[PDB]
């Protein structure tokens, strides 16, 4: 069966990296009339991907009809699926043509096609890299327009595009972007906004009077931490790498940050979604059982991961450090309340039970209606999530939160979300064991009422490594 073979041909040609004859594959497809299925073009997409950029001679025809093939499969509406814009991708990338990148990304569009951030990616980052801003913001607002939604790199891209070509108001937009999406910055993005702030075009830009009622209506209207108007002041900025303290006062400047309400409608948003997810993976059954329970029992200050708490820097289940946690979680609870801990039955019946009075105040708390035991099978992350959430209550896990599973849960409301419920424990030898607290302020970038901004670092770690800010404010 002619597809077939060309499928098994293609495969074949080539886990062997050979264009040439995958090139001349497709031709004589073409000149036998086998139509050529989403499978066929991948591989080919992909095979392409294995060619480079002649530095010594016009381009190689395996990039070059790479593009012409990507084009082709779209005229011939053939669907494309994920992995069709990662060779897409690659492809722009080892071509390192912007402008051609660009085409691609119009051409779906054209079609009705959706790009995926990694689509835009070579034709943003190539007219980075070669200076071209007014083509980088071309790609920008192709992007908004299709609603995808750049992360830190893409942002990063821009932000350096519009300091090299003396863009100010570029430059004050991308750093409001990079505060509502991103939040916290990287390493590189900290040192190029620390190079921003220092700069010529930062010292000459700004006003030195202007609508206070303006900027305080603005505060009010952007749920706060920043207000969107514009540079505010004058002259030279000064520009130190701080520390906030404990209460969210920057040790520099003595400004205390704020700390930002969360909508309680996103949150309910958010419950919905989180519901789903979990019915999606989940035996529905299970989940919706756990659901039901959760109505009939509580109030909870707390929801523990007992897993986590169990396991988190031990070489096995320490029913000791679950229990610690439990007490001082009780203790810290206004009227007392036990949380809920949340366990694999699994656990509440094996590990952590051998001895009978641990087995014993595990049927306690269960008993008390602070304890479920997560049938077998079930990933309890779902669970206290669902918990934490629903109960409005504080989530005490160490657990990074990096899983992919996690990763579904979006990049704007569960991190913020997280910073406002999420209690880690810690150890020293002198103390035992610690609650580590949310912050009583939102770690984030923010403007304030006068211009002066605050910038934090990201970091693997707040209680392992102290997290450093940039503190800029007008020298005036
Ligand atoms: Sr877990
Ligand atoms: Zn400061």
Same mark, same amino acid.
């Given at each position: 069966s002619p597809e077939a073979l060309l499928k098994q041909k293609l495969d074949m040609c080539s886990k062997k990296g050979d264009v040439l004859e995958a090139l001349r594959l497709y031709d004589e497809a073409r000149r036998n009339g086998v139509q050529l299925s989403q499978y066929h073009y991948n591989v080919l997409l992909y095979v392409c991907s294995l060619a480079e950029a002649a530095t010594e001679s016009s381009p190689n025809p395996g990039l070059s009809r790479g593009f012409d093939i990507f084009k082709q499969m779209i005229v011939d509406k053939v669907v494309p699926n994920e992995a069709t814009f990662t060779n897409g991708a690659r492809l722009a990338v080892a071509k390192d043509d912007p402008e051609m990148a660009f085409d691609m990304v119009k051409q779906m569009k054209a079609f009705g096609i959706q790009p995926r951030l990694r689509s835009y990616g070579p034709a943003l980052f190539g007219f980075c890299r070669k200076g071209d801003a007014d083509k980088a913001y071309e790609v920008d607002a192709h992007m908004v327009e299709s609603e995808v939604v750049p992360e830190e790199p893409e942002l990063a891209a821009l932000l350096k595009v519009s300091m090299d070509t003396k863009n100010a108001d570029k430059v004050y937009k991308t750093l409001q972007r990079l505060r509502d999406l991103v939040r916290q910055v990287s390493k590189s993005t900290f040192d190029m906004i620390e190079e921003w702030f220092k700069s010529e075009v930062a010292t000459k830009? $700004? %006003?030195? *009077?202007?609508?206070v009622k303006k900027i305080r209506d603005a505060v009010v209207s952007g749920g706060?931490?920043?207000?969107?108007q514009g540079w505010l002041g004058t002259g030279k900025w000064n520009v130190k790498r701080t520390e906030m303290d404990?209460? $969210? %006062?920057? *040790?520099?400047?003595?400004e205390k940050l704020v700390c930002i309400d969360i909508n309680p409608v996103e949150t309910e948003t958010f419950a919905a979604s989180l519901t789903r997810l979990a019915c999606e993976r989940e035996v529905k059954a299970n989940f919706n059982q756990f659901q039901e329970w959760l109505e009939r029992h509580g109030p909870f200050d707390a929801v523990i991961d007992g897993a986590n708490m169990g396991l988190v820097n031990q070489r096995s289940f320490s029913f000791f450090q679950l229990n610690n946690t439990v007490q001082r979680c009780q203790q810290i609870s206004p009227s007392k309340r036990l949380p809920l801990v949340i366990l694999h039955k699994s656990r509440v019946n094996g590990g952590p039970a051998t001895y009978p009075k641990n087995r014993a105040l595990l049927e306690k708390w269960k008993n008390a209606g602070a304890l479920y035991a997560t049938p077998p099978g079930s990933n309890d992350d779902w669970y206290w999530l669902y918990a934490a959430v629903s109960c409005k209550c504080l989530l005490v896990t160490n657990?990074?939160?990096?899983?992919?599973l996690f990763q579904?849960?979006?990049?704007?409301?569960f991190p913020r979300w997280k910073e406002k419920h999420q209690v880690r424990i810690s150890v020293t030898r002198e103390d035992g064991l610690k609650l580590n607290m949310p912050p009583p302020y939102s770690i984030v970038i923010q403007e304030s009422e006068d211009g002066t901004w605050h910038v934090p670092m990201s970091v693997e770690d707040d209680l392992q490594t102290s997290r450093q800010w940039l503190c800029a404010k007008r020298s005036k």
């Open positions: 830009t $700004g %006003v030195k *009077k202007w609508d706060g931490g920043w207000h969107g404990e209460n $969210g %006062v920057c *040790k520099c400047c003595k657990d990074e939160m990096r899983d992919h579904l849960l979006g990049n704007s409301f």
